[PDB]
Amino acid sequence: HVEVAAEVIFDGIPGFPITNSFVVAIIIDIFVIALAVAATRNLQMVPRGLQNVMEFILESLYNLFRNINAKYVATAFPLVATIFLFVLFGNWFGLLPGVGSIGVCGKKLVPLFRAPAADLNFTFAIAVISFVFIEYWGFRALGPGYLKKFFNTNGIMSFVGIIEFISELVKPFALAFRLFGNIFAGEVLLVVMAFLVPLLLPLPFYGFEVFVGFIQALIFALLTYAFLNIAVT
Amino acid sequence: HVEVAAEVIFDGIPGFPITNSFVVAIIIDIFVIALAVAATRNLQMVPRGLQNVMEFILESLYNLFRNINAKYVATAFPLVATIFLFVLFGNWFGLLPGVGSIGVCGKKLVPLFRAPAADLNFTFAIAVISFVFIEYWGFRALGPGYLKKFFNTNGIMSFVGIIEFISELVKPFALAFRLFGNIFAGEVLLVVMAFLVPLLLPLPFYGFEVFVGFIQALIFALLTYAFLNIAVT
Amino acid sequence: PIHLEIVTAERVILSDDVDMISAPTKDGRVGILPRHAPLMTILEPGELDIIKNGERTPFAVSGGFMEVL
Amino acid sequence: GINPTLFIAQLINFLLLIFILRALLYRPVMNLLNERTRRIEESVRDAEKVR
Amino acid sequence: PTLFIAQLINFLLLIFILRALLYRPVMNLLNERTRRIEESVRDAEKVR
Amino acid sequence: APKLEAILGVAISAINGFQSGKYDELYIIYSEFINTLVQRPAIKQLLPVESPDISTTTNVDYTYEPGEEEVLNSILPRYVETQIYQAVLESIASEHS
Amino acid sequence: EGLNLVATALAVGLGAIGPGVGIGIIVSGAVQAIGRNPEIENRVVTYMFIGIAFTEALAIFGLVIAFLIGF
Amino acid sequence: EGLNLVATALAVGLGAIGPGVGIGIIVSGAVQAIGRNPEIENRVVTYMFIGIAFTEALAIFGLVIAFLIGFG
Amino acid sequence: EGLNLVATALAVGLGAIGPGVGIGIIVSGAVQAIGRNPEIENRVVTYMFIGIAFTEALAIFGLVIAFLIGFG
Amino acid sequence: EGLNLVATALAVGLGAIGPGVGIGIIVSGAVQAIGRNPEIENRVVTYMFIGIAFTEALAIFGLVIAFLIGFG
Amino acid sequence: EGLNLVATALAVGLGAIGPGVGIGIIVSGAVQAIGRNPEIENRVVTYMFIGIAFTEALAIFGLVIAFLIGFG
Amino acid sequence: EGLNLVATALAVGLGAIGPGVGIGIIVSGAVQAIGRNPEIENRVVTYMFIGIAFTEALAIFGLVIAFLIGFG
Amino acid sequence: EGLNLVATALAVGLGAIGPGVGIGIIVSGAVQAIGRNPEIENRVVTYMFIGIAFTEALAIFGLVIAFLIGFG
Amino acid sequence: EGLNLVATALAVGLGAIGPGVGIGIIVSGAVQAIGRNPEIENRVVTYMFIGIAFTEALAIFGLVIAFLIGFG
Amino acid sequence: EGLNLVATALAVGLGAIGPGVGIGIIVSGAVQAIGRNPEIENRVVTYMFIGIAFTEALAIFGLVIAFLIGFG
Amino acid sequence: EGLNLVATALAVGLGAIGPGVGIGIIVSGAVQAIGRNPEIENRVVTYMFIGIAFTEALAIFGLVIAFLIGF
Structure with missing residues (x-):
């Protein structure tokens, strides 16, 4: 009962099919925009708490991109920073319980509740942009x-x-x-290895997966902006 | 075409079958004996011509043997030198024209033109000796x-x-x-390269093969010396 | 926190304790930390760098050697 | 799942996301960091002018 | 489904070890970051 | 107060000599300085054989980056130049005394 | 008969043969270079991750073909 | 016909071939760097484990299929 | 018969053993060269990338086959 | 039919070939580093084992799979 | 019988795996040698490309054979 | 049809492929370190064996199941 | 059947691995050696080619077998 | 159906692949150690022979199968 | 059905893959040593060639077997 | 059937794979060591060969099988 799947549509088709990929993309967009407004509204010269975290994240990314290249860091920073934030939060949301278990409203067609990058369309869209x-x-x-x-x-x-x-x-x-x-x-690792001893076994590969999600976000952004550096030269 | 066999019997057996290793290997031995008399007869204090070439070859072989081992450089010099000379002569003769085109005077008989070490008997006998x-x-x-x-x-x-x-x-x-x-x-490589594009295609490789044959001869000699070293200590 | 001494045939240049040494070893630039393994290197004409509490001093060295206990 | 409709819609969503974040968070954050950096430089200049 | 309860328990356990391993480092790094920022602000205002 | 740069003009050649075979040794006759009143002359060998009591070296081991041979070949001329410089400085001090 | 399963297995395994050694080599080389020159991370880490992504390209291609064959 | 068993065996073995050597190389390089500069340990060792993670990726994925066919 | 899938698998798998090691070796050598002599870095980087490209061809070639066999 | 028998044997050997070389490289590098700088042995060994047995993980994984191929 | 497709796959993959590692070693060694000294830049790079030539030739040969498998 | 015999042969051979190189590298590195200096020698000697032991474990695992694949 | 196609594919593929990696190794080694000691580069370059051709020989051996598959 | 013959050949060849490189690596490393420091020579050769034997054990294991397949 | 052609191709390719990289390493190490010390070039290079032959002999053995399978 | 020919070919080829690499490593290491130190030559060669030979034993074993399966 692993029930692995490549792409799903989770109904939501008012004439135009709205996959659950769009559901998770919209919920992650809401989360990231809420975080953004929470950080921006309480603007202080000396940052603390959530604002400090956001400032540190963008400062680290901006330093890394300047290390890659200095001329186009400011021009290309919006795209790569959004790439990192969006796909990182999608991958991390992919770890929340209910990845496949949610769907009990007939096979258990799932509200995606995982990374939108787990579907081909999202990754192809990001690749083409x-x-x-x-x-x-x-x-x-x-x-x-x-x-x-x-x-x-x-x-x-x-x-x-x-x-x-x-x-x-x-x-x-x-x-x-x-x-x-x-x-x-x-x-599929999480689900299939949950098929075997679903208790206390999935924690190491779980942590490995959250690490892999973060690393995939960072590596995709880095490769994009490094390809920009290659194209410029 | 492009036919080669590992078994050769030739013809004209005077109470014992005379294989291919008795009409081209015997000729090689005769040529080696002549080389020991066509340049070592009119010896001079200052070597010149064929005498100089033979002296240089002997000096190079002696230097290589002494580098391998000096306690028995002259003890095993005769057998090693004879093996090297015979192997080099056979390798050179095997690349001559008519190696596989002879014996037409019924399928063609490779004998009297093949290399002395091509047969599995002469090479085995030399190694056993x-x-x-x-x-x-x-x-x-x-x-x-x-x-x-x-x-x-x-x-x-x-x-x-x-x-x-x-x-x-x-x-x-x-x-x-x-x-x-x-x-x-x-x-076999010469024959196969002659099979496809018979003209001017097997120019380099065959020539390199000749060099390889020379190296092969030296290698055999060196191996013999190495065996003596294995026996020495 | 390693006892660095830039000595010379004429006089001693420095004898203080240093955070980092960006030594120009002949094979390639080598960095040194307080517990570096024993080492002995030949320098080439370059600009050795001394990192002292975040301050970089660029001592140019036209040549010399280095022993790292 | 290589439907052109979902592909183009997801691309449009990503363009909207990048533009919103550029107009809402990235520009204010870059402005604040640049202001703090120029302020530190001005503090160095102010120490020089004190001397 | 038992998959749901397994997912909660695994997620909560991972959150527990992740907190116990990274709450001090991350919160500290934030603390020295904001401390450096505020001491830079103090130095700037003192110099002004 | 000369600089080692000075003795180099002569030490380079003496060394290039022990390398060109032109020489088989190099001794320096210099004026030692025993007491502010005494200045005995003395001779030292300039051949870099070294090899003191294993006790003196304590056999400190290092990972010679360019190689043991390269480090030795680049360090022996500097060692003999330093010996010549020390002898010259001691000679100057003995001269003044 | 079961040949599709063998195909998927061959795809993933032969995809994992090479890039695993490649990522091992790149990580080891970068770590050695950093150990020799600590202050050179600024570009060493970036090129390490570029190389890791390029190695993992072959493995992800194998995984994609395995997904295509399985379904 | 036990071809699926051979499929699972091939998947797990061919997956385990590569990352094993990769981890060996990573650990060797990391230990060499530790022997060179001990005090950079806390950084390079980090760059050790992340790299090791990737190796396990290329293993576990195969291992995943090594189970996916194993149970259907 | 499933030889179509086996052919695709061998086209994608073989042709990934080599390029992976090639990328690893090339970029590790480049990184070590940067560590030894940072000053010329960008210069050697050029060759590094073109070398990458070469073996990347030997990758996607197989992929091309791994697509053609998939698409007939 | 011995397809499952061949599968078990192949899983064992194919999962064993890689981690063996990995452990070889790990031990060689760690021993070389120890010989160069003995005073840090207790640290590098701390990685050595957590590499060696770690690779065995993959190997034993295959071994486990082999047992599942055997009876299961 | 789909042996033609598996023949193309085997040819392309086995012709790619060798020259890939070959040119990987090529570029790694060349970059390191330039790192030791850039003054030989003119010579090395020339010979470097010769390397990428010969190895790639083998791969191209295999690739050519692959096409000959498709048509005849 | 005699397939279990090929199973046994494959198990033994594959179990020999990896650990052969593993102990080869281990002993080469240990002799390298010992030749660097003999004072630490005995220490690393122990490590050699334990490393070899771990690698031999993989080998003997196949050997063990070799019996299980031959006489069972 | 179509086993002749697989045979020629293996003949061109197998036998292009070892020669290719050997050419990679030889060109990298010659590059490094001339980079350290350019004064003999031409001379050692000669040896380089004496290597490559020999490796090519093995490759071309497999190559001729390819035609021996096509022409019987 | 001479499948036992294929078992014989596969066992012998795969037992030859591993140690064929293991003894090579041991001998190369130890010969380099002898070249640098000959005084410790005898000592390391005890380790070199210990290692060569441990590796050939694996090899002779396959050779054991080479007769167990052949004669009962 | 054509197993003899497959056997010939396997023999030639599997013989060529090993000694190919073997002789590549041979001449690469030879060139390394020559770059280190030109004077000893008169001796080791000779050893070089014997290794070049003595390794390649194994490879050429396979080719012989190929011919022994090509026409019985 | 023709399975004996495939067996002979597998024996010879798989026997040749490993020893080629190993012997390459041996001779490369010995040549480099002699190039570094010439006076130790006669020792390392004395070890070289008593190493090198062992390797081909395995290869020769395969060749032996390459005939035993043949006849």
Whole structure:
């Protein structure tokens, strides 16, 4: 009764199908916006509590991105910071009890109550937004572009470059597949290993999964902005 | 085409079958004997021409043997030098034209043109002779000796003396297999490269094979010396 | 918290205790911490860095050696 | 689940999210950090001017 | 479902060990961060 | 008060000599300084054999980064240059006394 | 007959053969470089994580193919 | 026909081949760095375990399927 | 028969053993080079990435097959 | 039919090949570091074991699976 | 009989796994050597690419064979 | 059809593949450290064996189940 | 059946692994050696090629078997 | 159906793969140690032979099967 | 049905994969040592070639077996 | 059927896989050690060979099987 699934739609179809992926995306958006307004409204010169936590998180991210690159850190910070916050909170919400058990209102079709990254559509959307962002900034910075990735041996053999172009193409696919695969495989780990001794056994892999969710958020954001750095140069 | 066999019988048996190792290996031995008389007859204080070439080859072989071992550089010089010269001559003759195109004068007979070590009998006989010489030299040098080969208990391990004995026993078979496989594989590679694109395709490899054959010969000689070292201490 | 001594054939430059040493070893730049394993290195012309309570002093060294107990 | 409708709708949701956070939290936070940094620099300059 | 109760108990246990292991480090790091911020503010106002 | 840079002009050559085989040893005759009134002349060997009582070294072990051979080959000329510099300074002190 | 299960198993296992060794190598190399040069984390950590993601690309591709075959 | 049993066996074994060597390499490098600079331990050891985590990922995923076929 | 799935699995699995080790070795060597000589970092980084790209080809090639076999 | 028998044996061996090399690398690196800097032995060993047995985890995992292949 | 697809998969994967690690070692060694000294930049890189050539050739050969499996 | 015999052979061989390299690396590293200096030698000697023991455990595990796969 | 296709696929795939990794190792080693001691680079470069060709030999051996599968 | 012959071959070959590298690594490391410090030589060779034997135990285990399959 | 072609391909490929990397390591270590000390080049290089042969012999043995299977 | 030929091929190939790598490691290490210190040559070679030989024993074992299965 593991009941593993790749994609679900949880009804909610008033003419337009509203998957439970959208349900969890909206609830996480509500949570993150509530956290944002709670931090911003009580604005103090010396931050404490929740405001201190938010300031520390953005300061750490901004420092990391400046370490990657200094010129485009401010321009590209909104996208990558939203990526990190959104997918991190989705992955962490994927650990709350009720990932599959909720659904008792007929098979137990589930309110997603897990990471929205556990579905292909979310990861593909984030991958394509990242890819179009990278390409737009590559055009803006390099100018005409394609000096490399388009034959034209100029200090580097043209043979390398068709390979770079196809690597550029596969990069969004690799990113989306990495996020989806890690989250979905961790979910299936939790469920399947709960099939075996559901008591006191799932805690180590549970903690491993919360760590993997955080690391996946950070690594996806870092890879996106590092690809921006590669495209600029 | 592209046919090769490991069994050769030739024809003209005067009470005993004369295989391919009696019409090209005997010619190789005759050429080696001539080389010991076509340049060592008119000896001079200052070497020149073929005498100089033979002196240089002998000096290089003697230097290599002394580097391997100086206590018996001249003790095993005759057998090692003869084996190296015969193997090199056979390898050179195996790459000559008509190696597999001879015997048409009924399928063609590879004999009288193949390498001396190509046959599984001549190479095995040479390896057996080398192993017998090494064993005799070791017995003469160490008297009874064979302390490691006796499997006597020592301070290293109690299971030793069997793996060393197995390796020593396989050494003649290993050398015979190495020589025969190298020669047969060189011939088969030449034939196979002639099978597809017969013109100008097997130019480099065959030539390199000749060099390999030379190295092979030296390796055999070196192995013999190494065997003596194994017998020495 | 390691007893650093920049000595020279003429005089002693420093004898204080230091947080970090960004030594320019010949093979590659090496950092040293209060419990570094025993070491002996050859320097190359570079700018050795002394990190003292968050303050970086760039002592340029045209060459020399280093023993790290 | 590679439906173009869900794909495009999720993309639109992400664009809305990034724009809301840029206009609500990221800009105020960056402004506050830049203000504090320039204020520390001004404090260094003020010590120099005291001297 | 027993999956639900297993999920609660596992989640609560993980929260317990996570708190007992990271409540001191994270809250401390926040404390020294805000302490550095406020002492910088104090230094700025004193210099002004 | 000269600097080691000075003795280098001569010590480099003496050493390049014990390396070019041109020499098989280097002794320095310098003026020791025993008492503010005494200044006995003295000779020292400049060949870097070293190897004092194993007790003196205590066999301190290190992980020589460039290699034991490289460290030794770069440290022996500096050791003999330091010996020459110390001898020259002692000679200057004895001269003044 | 059960060949699809063997296919999924081969996909995941042969995906895990390589990237596991790759991530081991990159983590060990970065840790050694940091041990030799403590202050070089600023780019070492970033390149370590880039390499870890690129290694895990092959494993996630194997996992995706396993998911495709299983369902 | 016990082909599913062979499937589970192949999954678990081929999963365990790689991450084992990966963990070995990570631990060796971490211990070398500890021997070099002990006082950076609390950082590099961290970069140890996170890396080890990834290895277990590539194991457990296979192990997951090593159970998923095992029970259906 | 299920040889279609086995072919896809072998196309994705084999062709991942090599590139994974290639990425690990390349980027670990680059990181160690940065640790030794930070000053030239970006320079060597160039080659690092192009090397990455090369073995990435040897990855997606298999993936291409792993898609074509999937799509006939 | 011995498909389950082959599965059990294959699971054992295939899960054993990797962690063995992992433990070998762990022990070699830890012993080298100990030889270089003995005074930190008690620390590096603290990692050595929590690596060695840790890899055994994966191995014993496969071993456990093998028993499940055997009777279960 | 789907042996053609498994043949393509085996060819591409086994031709990718070798040259991938080969070029990985190529780039790692080249980057480290440049790290020791960039003055040999002109020579090393040249020879570097020769490496990526030869290994990749083998892979390309396998890839070519893969196509020959598809058509004939 | 004699498949259990191949099971036994595969078990023994695979159990030999990994630990062979494991103890090889262990002994190489231990001899390396001892040749660095002999004073700590005895200490690391013990560790060698215990590490070897752990690796041998994996091997003997296969050997153990080898009997269980041969005579059972 | 179609086992000839699998045979030629294995002939081109297997036998392109070892030569490829050996070429990687040799070019990396020659790169490092010339990087430390450029004064002999040409000369050792010669040895490099004497390595690669030999490795190529093994590869091309497998290569010829490929045609021996196509042409019987 | 000579499946026992395949058992023989597989056991022998897989028992040869592991120790074939293990003895190699032991001998290489110990020979390097001898090259640097020869005085401790005899001591380490006791460890080198101890290790070589432990590794060949695994090997001869397969060889045991090589006869157990052949003769009863 | 074609098992002889598969046997020939397996023999040649599995023989080539090992000694290929073996001889790569051979010449790489040789070039390393030559870069260390050119003077000893007159001796070790010779040893190099014997290893080049003496390893490759194993590989070429497989090729012989391939031919022994190609035509009985 | 032809399973004996597949057995012979597997024996020879899988026997050759490991010893090739091991012998490469042995000779590479010995060459590097001699290059560092020449005077120890005659010792390390004396150990080199008594190491190297052991390895091919396993390989030769396979070759032995490669004939025993053959005939």
